[PDB]
Amino acid sequence: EGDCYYSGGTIISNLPFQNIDSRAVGKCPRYVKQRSLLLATGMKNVPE
Amino acid sequence: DKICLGHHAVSNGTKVNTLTERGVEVVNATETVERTNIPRICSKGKRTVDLGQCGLLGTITGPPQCDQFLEFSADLIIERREGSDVCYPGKFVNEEALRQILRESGG
Amino acid sequence: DIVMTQSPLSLSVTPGEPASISCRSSHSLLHLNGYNYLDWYLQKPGQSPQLLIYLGSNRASGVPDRFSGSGSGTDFTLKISRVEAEDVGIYYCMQALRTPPGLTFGGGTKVDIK
Amino acid sequence: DIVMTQSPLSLSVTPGEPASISCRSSHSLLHLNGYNYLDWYLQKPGQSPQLLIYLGSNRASGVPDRFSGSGSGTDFTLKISRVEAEDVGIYYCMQALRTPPGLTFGGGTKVDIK
Amino acid sequence: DIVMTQSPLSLSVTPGEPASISCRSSHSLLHLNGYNYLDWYLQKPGQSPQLLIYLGSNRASGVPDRFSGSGSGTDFTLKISRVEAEDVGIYYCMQALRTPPGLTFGGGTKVDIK
Amino acid sequence: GAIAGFIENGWEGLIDGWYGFRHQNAQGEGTAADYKSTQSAIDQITGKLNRLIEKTNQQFELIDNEFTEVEKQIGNVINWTRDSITEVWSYNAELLVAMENQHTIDLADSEMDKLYERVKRQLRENAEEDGTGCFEIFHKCDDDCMASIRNNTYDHSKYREEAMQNRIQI
Amino acid sequence: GAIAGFIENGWEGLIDGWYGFRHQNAQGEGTAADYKSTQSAIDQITGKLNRLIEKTNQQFELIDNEFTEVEKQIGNVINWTRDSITEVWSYNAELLVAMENQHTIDLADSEMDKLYERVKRQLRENAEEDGTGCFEIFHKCDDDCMASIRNNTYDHSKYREEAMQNRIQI
Amino acid sequence: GAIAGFIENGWEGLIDGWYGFRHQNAQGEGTAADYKSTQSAIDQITGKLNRLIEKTNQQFELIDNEFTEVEKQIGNVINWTRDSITEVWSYNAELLVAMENQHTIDLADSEMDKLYERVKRQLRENAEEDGTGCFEIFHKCDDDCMASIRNNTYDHSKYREEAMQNRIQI
Amino acid sequence: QLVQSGAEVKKPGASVKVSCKASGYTFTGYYLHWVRQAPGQGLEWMGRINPDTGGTNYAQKFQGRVSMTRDMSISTHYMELSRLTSDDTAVYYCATKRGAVTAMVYYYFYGMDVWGQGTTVTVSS
Amino acid sequence: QLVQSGAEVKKPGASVKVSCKASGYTFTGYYLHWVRQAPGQGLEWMGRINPDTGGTNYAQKFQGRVSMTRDMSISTHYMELSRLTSDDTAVYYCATKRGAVTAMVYYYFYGMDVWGQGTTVTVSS
Amino acid sequence: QLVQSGAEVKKPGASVKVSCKASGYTFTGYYLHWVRQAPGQGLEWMGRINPDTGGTNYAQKFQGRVSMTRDMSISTHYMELSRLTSDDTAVYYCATKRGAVTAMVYYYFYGMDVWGQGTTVTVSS
Ligand SMILES: *[C@@H]1O[C@H](CO)[C@@H](O)[C@H](O)[C@H]1NC(C)=O
Ligand SMILES: *[C@@H]1O[C@H](CO)[C@@H](O)[C@H](O)[C@H]1NC(C)=O
Ligand SMILES: *[C@@H]1O[C@H](CO)[C@@H](O)[C@H](O)[C@H]1NC(C)=O
Ligand SMILES: *[C@@H]1O[C@H](CO)[C@@H](O)[C@H](O)[C@H]1NC(C)=O
Ligand SMILES: *[C@@H]1O[C@H](CO)[C@@H](O)[C@H](O)[C@H]1NC(C)=O
Ligand SMILES: *[C@@H]1O[C@H](CO)[C@@H](O)[C@H](O)[C@H]1NC(C)=O
Ligand SMILES: *[C@@H]1O[C@H](CO)[C@@H](O)[C@H](O)[C@H]1NC(C)=O
Ligand SMILES: *[C@@H]1O[C@H](CO)[C@@H](O)[C@H](O)[C@H]1NC(C)=O
Ligand SMILES: *[C@@H]1O[C@H](CO)[C@@H](O)[C@H](O)[C@H]1NC(C)=O
């Protein structure tokens, strides 16, 4: 089951941003120009 | 006779960017930008018409390659590159306004 | 609107041969924290449901090592290494990705001794 | 550019019959916190102005219960339940919604004994 | 990609007449905090480089008052009020505006006694 | 040797929780985890992450054509508009991720602070702060006494007359 | 019975202010409000709300037509552009409201904290923290003494020799 | 006269740093600066300012014409789209500058707080807080003793038996 | 462990209220879920309540006619389902998270671990 | 209560400076407003000053030729109006908020409650 | 002041590792830079390391084949350059910020003030 198509396949993900095609149609994630945007899920690391 | 309070740490963490600093070591991180896709038109639960050698505007006029699409019905129309609209040479007038009509038409 | 579809909808088993129950999702169950929000339940006739796997792959407290969980994304399988006579009943899969839609259950899979 | 327009621009009253002064705004005087920024003033001849109503409907400290304030949005009315001989003078309405435009006053309403 | 271009690429000087070395940038070296990120260096033959000016106009610690720095934006000049015999060697300009591009040096300017 | 707390560094031996304790008395050492402060930190991050996995309901359709190219003046208005909007969503994505990294780091740093003044108001006059994230208890606190600070059942008046002789006089 | 402070819960009997005091001595109980901390919290919220009631000066005119429909290829570029911009202003509205709800909650929680270390540095060595948001005064503080903590006129050296006998010795 | 700290006002005599100390003993007065807290505050602001001087790589070309005007219906779609995007970048600029002014003010206010609890845990039981940002040392601390608080080499156990006689008894 | 109330027989149009006493909980900040199982059919999630605040999240099917409350002094949860029909004949389970588990992955679990014994509700005439 | 300075007679081109001593204020974080009333005409708001910081907000009519300062040690406010004309003949009021009012709605009031006695300024030849 | 390691002769394909002992640093939160000077050519910036965290920033020319580490207990920095060629014959300098300077403008300086003596590295056969 897909919902967001482009000329090379289908984007199926829970991520809110994508960097595959500008012209993806349907109910798609927002196209950004960056290819990596890391979101911190933990605390700041201070090693021993 | 003492009691301490501390937080956990790992040997090597992930570097993320912050508002005032680039490359802060956090313990864990995740990716927010999608780069991998599924290289098929996965369309379960829909009514998909695959035109192929036929063009979208040809089904109005009916060349020989569009004989089985003259009264088609679809929830999702897939146009291919090798599809042609005409058999005798010629073209439509305001062809891109007509293509946006039949893409949205449902049949 | 995540729709859970279970299979093979019934499974006659032999006490000593493995079994496998699959439950495929409509949308992706993988959160941003890297966990697949799928729970495997067993409800015996007359009792409350029992939790078996709680995040796609992690076994619960009072569950033996017969029950295993694998899968990621939309396709998931419950796996039993060997079946005993105490492993009959109905197996439900349950997703818990987003709460303002809600939590939904699978259809169920009756497992009886053949 | 909020413009205050007062009415009836003069009001001959009788000591024992009620009176009513209206002051309508150009833009809405209702803030996001739910209050209407309109103040009612009375200036006697020779004295400083006296505050009567300070947020559209709330009476000040040394003001009797004769003076009442109602209205919301752009249309506002001052209301006197009964007029005494000490209630003559000029009545100004004043809005205080946004300060980088500024605070502006009404034209005034002379009230004399008929 | 900031490219530093120095001039006059060689300078024969007289011990008692002033000298001037210019180094013009490709992009603007003026940060948002109001400082021009340009450093002036002197490397004698056989020794480590010596810092002379560290933010376009500010003299370092062990530098005499002969060496002066001026300029803003893209065009910069090093200025010597009078030249001694200990002021020979190669003069490099170095920008430090953005580090993910990196720090880059100028071509150099040989200064010898005429 | 000696033990230090969260002010100096973080422990790589804490694996069942984010925040924890570490005591040192006559019976030996010990290390426990804090389940109420770890769960409170994770409940704010997956709640932050639940805000980002909700997809739009606005359907965008096709206005260009990859096979037969559109007219050039309308093919440049579409191309100029799509690059304008792409600058907005590339700015908002990079701003939101960098802003929520400052909030994630700061919320997990305030949960360790909230655990620190919770123990500090438990040990009212029976302990002194070391300066590295530890408390110097001035009475003989055994392994079930150290459990009482951990589970918020400490009573300071039981040891108040004993720990005050060790502070102002000795 | 006993009284607790802001750490446990909030009082539903405070109606003339946001933050306030509650004392308990030999004369009885009492409840007052703090006008300087309530006004400081409200002055930051209506100043925050004054930022949102300022309207744009950019006039947008009509490019479609509700009665006689425009040409279809220019009727789809207008419709695709207007839905793109609508996604931006629906994202920015939901982001700004959710961000200023975190700031409103946190600024009113730091005004209660600022009132707490103001009283704590007034009662220097004459009082001890209970742990629920209250101070245990170790001298006989009557109804005008309790007024002196409220209006920042407390002098700790007047009761320092009396309240120190009750702490380290008794 | 008397000296006050950061709670009351800020010193106009501090010119080589952002944060500093000011002592008062028998030898006289003195004023120094703190280089480790000033550098930590400036390293977060130029790192904040390094985020804003990075220019886009998206090249925008010309679609209108200043000399020979375009067709009127395509000249209004371009004009309506460019004013829509201009509202977005005028909102995002005014939001980002106002948000990073709240962060700049608050980060420099927390560096002064972090310098305050660093000295407070150094002077463990030998000093008391005045309430204006100063510490009342209860032992004879000369000009090299005052240097030891400044450079984090203070040992509280050297003066603990002397400064405790001056607090609880005298 | 959870202990529910006994069986109840109701009429179409009345309201049923079920009890669930969470005995032995020192966190009380987890999520407690009410699910439903008609005889013959499968499990059916009704809603979820937060014992810290009281914030509820019902299903869209059970929206409007379900009110869930709690009384944290006696540690007892409630669920009231108004405007009953014959298809509300089912067994009503309350479930929540177990707690005192020493795994790191268990912090990211918000479902149902420990369950009640069930409450049979019959609606007929 | 506010007490202003006496009457002043000036010439066109000079500058007038009015005083306003706020006696009895323990908050000193309210807003003090200067308004104006020409003989025959109505009230006219000039500006507003913050005694905590010194941030002023003048009207667009009185922008450029009005400077308002204060001296919080003696608790005295000032207002200087340069380049006088004949139409600056008026009575100058300083007003502010009263304080010590036990209403919740009074915290959202930023206008004028307590007023000064007025200062008559005459500009002629 | 900085003191580097002695000269080293290597072969094409090996890896060179240079030492730099920062003796007398009480801040240890500045930036330490490694630059390079081939015989005849000019200076060439390699990278920059943070002794607090370990975050490195190499040049695009030296990206992939440079690893910079430090050991803050003995206060010693390292730089390892793998897959050597003949054009890596140069003198390797480590430089950093001086510190204990009483100017306000010196806080906004992130370049090179105090330098090492240099390390001659020769790659031949
Ligand atoms: C980080 O997250 C992943 C997936 O959520 C998990 O497998 C891993 O254990 C976590 N921790 C580290 C240190 O990678
Ligand atoms: C909330 O605001 C409204 C209008 O601003 C006011 O009438 C009401 O008293 C306030 N408080 C509550 C508890 O509703
Ligand atoms: C402000 O910054 C400028 C340039 O960065 C500098 O010249 C000036 O000394 C700084 N301080 C003040 C008080 O202007
Ligand atoms: C618009 O951009 C696309 C790239 O996605 C390009 O293929 C196309 O030729 C462009 N159209 C015009 C008219 O330049
Ligand atoms: C807390 O720990 C102490 C010592 O282990 C124990 O006696 C007490 O019952 C515990 N209380 C709770 C509520 O767990
Ligand atoms: C554009 O959208 C409007 C809805 O507001 C619709 O009425 C109109 O038909 C649409 N135009 C085209 C060309 O589809
Ligand atoms: C503070 O309160 C005390 C006791 O009520 C009183 O004596 C004193 O005058 C008050 N001071 C001020 C400034 O209000
Ligand atoms: C579009 O706006 C420009 C102003 O930059 C104006 O000169 C031009 O005439 C406008 N075009 C139309 C069609 O109104
Ligand atoms: C700190 O200062 C004291 C007194 O000036 C001095 O004896 C000591 O050596 C200093 N320590 C450091 C690390 O600078």
UniProtKB/TrEMBL annotation, chain B:
Disulfide bonds join 54-66. It is found in: Host apical cell membrane; Virion membrane. It comes from the Viruses. In natural infection, inactive HA is matured into HA1 and HA2 outside the cell by one or more trypsin-like, arginine-specific endoprotease secreted by the bronchial epithelial cells. One identified protease that may be involved in this process is secreted in lungs by club cells. Palmitoylated. Glycans are attached at residue 28. Belongs to the influenza viruses hemagglutinin family. Binds to sialic acid-containing receptors on the cell surface, bringing about the attachment of the virus particle to the cell. This attachment induces virion internalization of about two third of the virus particles through clathrin-dependent endocytosis and about one third through a clathrin- and caveolin-independent pathway. Plays a major role in the determination of host range restriction and virulence. Class I viral fusion protein. Homotrimer of disulfide-linked HA1-HA2. This is Hemagglutinin. It comes from Influenza A virus (A/Shanghai/JS01/2013(H7N9)). The chain holds residues 19 to 125 of 560 of the full protein.
